[PDB]
UniProtKB/Swiss-Prot annotation, chain A:
Belongs to the WD repeat UTP18 family. The chain holds residues 13 to 44 of 594 of the full protein. Interacts with snoRNA U3. Interacts with MPP10, UTP21 and UTP25. Component of the ribosomal small subunit (SSU) processome composed of at least 40 protein subunits and snoRNA U3. Involved in nucleolar processing of pre-18S ribosomal RNA and ribosome assembly. Present with 9570 molecules/cell in log phase SD medium. The gene is UTP18. This is U3 small nucleolar RNA-associated protein 18. It is found in: Nucleus, Nucleolus. The lineage of its organism: Eukaryota, Fungi, Dikarya, Ascomycota, Saccharomycotina.
From Swiss-Prot, chain B:
The chain holds residues 1 to 52 of 489 of the full protein. The gene is SOF1. It is found in: Nucleus, Nucleolus. Interacts with snoRNA U3. Interacts with NOP1 and MPP10. Component of the ribosomal small subunit (SSU) processome composed of at least 40 protein subunits and snoRNA U3. This is Protein SOF1. Belongs to the WD repeat DCAF13/WDSOF1 family. Present with 6620 molecules/cell in log phase SD medium. It comes from the Eukaryota. Required for ribosomal RNA processing.
From Swiss-Prot, chain D:
This is U3 small nucleolar RNA-associated protein 7. Disulfide bonds: none annotated. Involved in nucleolar processing of pre-18S ribosomal RNA. Transmembrane segments: none annotated. The gene is UTP7. Present with 5800 molecules/cell in log phase SD medium. It is found in: Nucleus, Nucleolus. The chain holds residues 377 to 473 of 554 of the full protein.
C-alpha cells in the first residue's frame, strides 16, 4: 500500500519534515 | 555510519518569548527519582510541623 | 575504530562546539567533577588550579 | 596519563582529565535525553534555582535515613510480630505468662 | 596559554545557542525594526506573518525572490535552527543566505525589504553567524539610518574593526572612516571575493558600484605616497578591473574605466601591462554610453607611461581590434570636441600602426594632423616612419600631400631627419 502524494504532503507538515526543505535548499546554487 | 547524538535544539525547552513560562519536560522513570518513601516521609513530617 | 576526528564532522554543531578540548599545560593532572546538572564544570589542578 | 573521567549527566560527552588539560570526547549514547525538570535542569534561571535550593532545604533527607534499601524506611520493625495483636490476643499472651 | 582566553573562543563559537531565558532575551532582542521590549515579547510565527507579506511584496517587485519563498521562507523553515543542524548542511544554509542578500542588496530603500530581512536576522541568527556578507551588502548605505541600525545589532568581525567606535553611535559613519576601513590590505581581497560573487550572480547596480569606485580611487590616492604599498595593491584592483570589464553590463565597464585611469595616473606601469589593459577594454565594449568613456581611458592610459618605445607601433592584434571597435571617423569626431583632452601620445602611436599595417588610408592622418596639435618628438617619429613608408610603398601622390603638410609647418624637422636617413634632394626624386 504505497501512499498518495496528497497524504504524503499532509504527512510532511504534520510530522515536522525537514528533509524536503533541506533537499530544496541544496538544490539551488547560483541558478542565475 | 549511523551516528546521531542528543539534539536538544534549544527551542522547545527555553521559550522564544519572554512572556511564556519555561516548559517542564518530564521523565517519570523510577531511576531518575531515587528516594521515594524516604522523601515523602520528610514531606509528611514538614506537613505536621507546618500544621502545628 | 570510529575516532573523534570524524565524529565531529558527522555530529551537529551544538554538541560539536560542546566538545571542549582545553590546554592547561603548566599544572598537574586535572580532576574533573561536573555538576549534577550538566551546566557547570570544576577542574582541580594537582598543583594549584 | 588520565586522572579521572566524568560524564555530563544530560548530554552525551565524557570529560577526561589529563595532565595538559581537559578534553570532551563525544559519545552517541551515554547521557539520558529526557531530563526531569523537578530534580535537575540544565536550563535553569536564577529565580528557578534560588527557589529550588530553599525547597530542597525543606525536603532534605536526614542522615539517619541512609540504609541498604530506601524502601525499608516506612516499614514495620522486624523484631515485632508480623501479625498485629488484639486486646483479646494481648490478654491471651498474658494467659501465656 | 591561559584559561580565560580559551573561554572566549568557546563563547564566540556558542554565541547563538540559547541556554537560559536571559540568553534568549539577549539574542531575540536583536531587532531591525522593532525596539528592544517588543522584540523580546514576540513569537516566531508573528515575525513570520510579516515576513511572508514582505517577500510577497518583493516577489511583485522582482521575481527572483520566488525561489526563496520555497527554500528559506517556507513554513517548514521555522522549527529548524542553525545550532541543531550539522556541518554538511549549514554550508548550504550559509550560501543560500548569501544568495538572498546579493539578490536583495539593491532593494534596501523599501520597507518590504527591511521586514523581509528582519525575520532572517531573528530565525537564522545572521547578525552573529555570518556578519560579513550582511555588512558588505548594506555598506553603500552607510549614510542611511538602516546601517546605523545594523551596527547596533551586529557583532563586528576582526576585519571591520575601524567601525568599532560607530556601533550604537548617534552620528553615522563618515566618508573618511570608510576609506580607513578600505585601507586594510586584507579587506580589499575580501571585497574582491564579494565583488566577484556580485558579478557572477549578475546583480550589480549603480549605487554600490558608484560607492566602490569612490573607495577604490581613494585607497590608491591614500596610498600614493608609499610606493611599496601600491605595489602590494596592484594585483587586487587590476583583478577587480579584469572581472569588472568581463561583465556585460552597461555599468561595470564604466566603473572599470574609472579604476584603470586613476590607478595608472598615480602609478606608471609596464608597457605590456597597459597593453593588456587595451585588449581587456577593447574586447567586450558594446555599450553606447561606455564607448566614449573607453576612448578617454585608452587616451589617458597611453600618456601615463613614459619611456623609450612609449609611442611605438601597436601589435596588429590590438590595431585591428581597435579598427573594428573604433572607426577612424569616430575618433576624428572625438577630436572635434573643443574640450580636446591630452591624446598626444596615443595618436602618434595610432598613426604609426596605421602606416605599418593598413598602408592604404593616409587621408586620415591628413585629417588627424590638422585636428590635433602634436609635440616635437612625436612629429619626428611620425615623419621617420613615413620616410620609411616612402622607401617601401609604391608611392602615391597622397604621400607627397602628407609631406607637403610636413614642409608647410616645421620644415627644419623633416629636413633634419632626411639628413639622418638619406638625402634632402632625393625626396623629390622619390616622391
Amino acid at each position: 500500500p504505497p501512499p498518495d502524494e496528497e497524504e504524503q504532503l499532509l504527512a510532511k507538515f504534520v510530522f515536522g519534515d525537514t528533509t524536503d526543505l533541506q533537499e530544496n535548499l541544496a538544490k539551488f546554487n547560483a541558478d542565475f | 555510519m549511523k551516528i546521531k547524538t542528543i539534539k536538544r535544539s534549544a527551542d522547545d525547552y527555553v521559550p522564544v518569548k519572554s512572556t511564556q513560562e519555561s516548559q517542564m519536560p518530564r521523565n517519570l522513570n523510577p531511576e531518575l527519582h531515587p528516594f521515594e518513601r524516604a522523601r515523602e516521609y520528610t514531606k509528611a513530617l514538614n506537613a505536621t510541623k507546618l500544621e502545628r | 575504530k570510529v575516532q573523534q576526528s570524524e565524529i565531529k564532522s558527522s555530529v551537529d554543531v551544538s554538541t560539536a562546539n560542546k566538545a571542549l578540548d582545553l590546554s592547561l599545560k603548566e599544572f598537574g593532572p586535572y580532576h574533573i567533577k561536573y555538576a549534577k546538572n550538566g551546566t557547570h564544570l570544576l577542574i582541580t589542578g594537582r598543583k594549584g588550579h | 596519563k588520565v586522572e579521572n573521567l566524568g560524564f555530563v549527566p544530560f548530554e552525551d560527552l565524557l570529560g577526561v582529565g589529563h595532565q595538559t588539560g581537559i578534553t570532551n570526547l563525544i559519545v552517541p549514547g551515554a547521557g539520558e535525553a529526557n531530563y526531569d525538570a523537578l530534580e535537575l535542569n540544565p536550563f535553569e534561571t536564577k529565580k528557578q534555582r534560588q527557589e529550588q535550593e530553599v525547597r530542597t532545604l525543606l525536603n532534605k533527607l536526614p542522615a539517619d535515613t541512609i540504609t541498604l534499601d530506601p524502601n525499608s524506611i516506612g516499614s514495620v520493625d522486624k523484631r515485632s510480630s508480623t501479625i498485629r495483636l488484639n486486646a483479646k490476643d494481648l490478654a491471651q499472651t498474658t494467659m501465656d505468662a | 596559554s591561559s584559561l580565560s582566553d580559551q573561554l572566549a573562543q568557546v563563547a564566540s563559537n556558542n554565541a547563538t545557542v540559547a541556554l537560559d531565558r536571559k540568553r534568549r532575551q539577549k539574542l531575540h532582542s536583536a531587532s531591525l525594526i522593532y525596539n528592544s521590549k517588543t522584540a523580546a515579547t514576540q513569537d516566531y510565527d508573528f515575525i513570520f506573518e510579516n515576513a511572508s507579506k514582505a517577500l510577497e511584496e518583493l516577489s511583485q517587485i522582482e521575481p527572483k525572490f520566488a525561489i526563496f519563498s520555497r527554500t528559506l521562507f517556507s513554513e517548514s523553515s521555522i522549527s529548524l535552527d542553525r545550532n541543531v543542524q550539522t556541518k554538511e548542511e549549514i554550508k548550504d544554509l550559509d550560501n543560500a543566505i548569501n544568495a538572498y542578500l546579493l539578490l536583495a542588496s539593491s532593494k534596501w530603500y523599501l520597507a518590504p525589504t527591511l521586514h523581509a530581512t528582519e525575520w532572517l536576522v531573528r530565525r537564522f541568527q545572521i547578525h552573529v553567524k555570518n556578519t560579513e556578507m550582511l555588512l558588505l551588502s548594506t555598506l553603500n548605505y552607510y549614510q542611511t539610518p538602516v546601517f546605523k541600525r545594523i551596527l547596533s545589532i551586529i557583532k563586528l568581525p576582526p576585519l571591520f574593526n575601524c567601525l568599532s567606535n560607530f556601533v550604537r553611535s548617534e552620528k553615522p559613519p563618515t566618508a573618511l572612516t570608510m576609506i580607513k576601513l578600505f585601507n586594510d590590505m586584507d579587506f580589499l581581497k575580501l571585497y574582491t571575493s564579494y565583488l566577484d560573487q556580485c558579478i557572477k550572480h549578475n546583480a550589480t547596480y549603480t549605487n554600490q558600484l558608484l560607492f566602490t569606485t569612490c573607495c577604490f580611487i581613494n585607497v590608491v590616492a591614500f596610498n600614493s605616497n608609499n610606493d611599496e604599498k601600491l605595489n602590494q595593491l596592484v594585483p587586487i584592483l587590476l583583478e577587480i578591473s579584469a572581472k569588472l570589464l568581463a561583465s556585460k553590463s552597461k555599468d561595470c565597464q564604466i566603473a572599470a574605466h574609472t579604476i584603470l585611469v586613476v590607478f595608472a595616473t598615480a602609478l606608471p606601469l609596464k608597457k605590456t601591462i597597459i597593453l593588456a589593459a587595451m585588449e581587456t577594454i577593447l574586447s567586450n565594449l558594446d555599450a553606447k554610453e561606455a564607448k566614449h568613456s573607453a576612448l578617454l581611458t585608452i587616451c589617458k592610459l597611453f600618456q601615463t607611461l613614459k619611456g623609450q618605445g612609449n609611442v611605438d607601433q601597436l601589435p596588429s592584434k590590438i590595431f585591428k581590434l581597435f579598427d573594428s571597435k573604433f572607426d577612424t571617423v569616430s575618433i576624428l569626431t572625438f577630436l572635434d570636441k573643443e574640450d580636446k583632452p591630452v591624446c598626444d601620445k596615443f595618436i602618434t602611436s595610432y598613426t604609426r600602426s596605421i602606416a605599418r599595417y593598413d598602408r592604404s588610408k593616409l587621408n586620415i592622418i591628413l585629417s588627424l594632423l590638422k585636428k590635433i596639435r602634436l609635440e616635437r618628438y612625436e612629429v619626428r617619429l611620425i615623419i621617420t616612419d613615413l620616410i620609411y613608408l616612402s622607401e617601401i610603398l609604391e608611392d602615391k601622390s597622397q604621400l607627397v600631400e602628407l609631406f607637403e603638410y610636413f614642409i608647410s609647418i616645421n620644415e627644419d624637422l623633416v629636413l633634419k631627419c632626411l639628413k639622418s636617413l638619406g638625402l634632402t634632394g632625393x625626396x623629390x626624386x622619390x616622391x
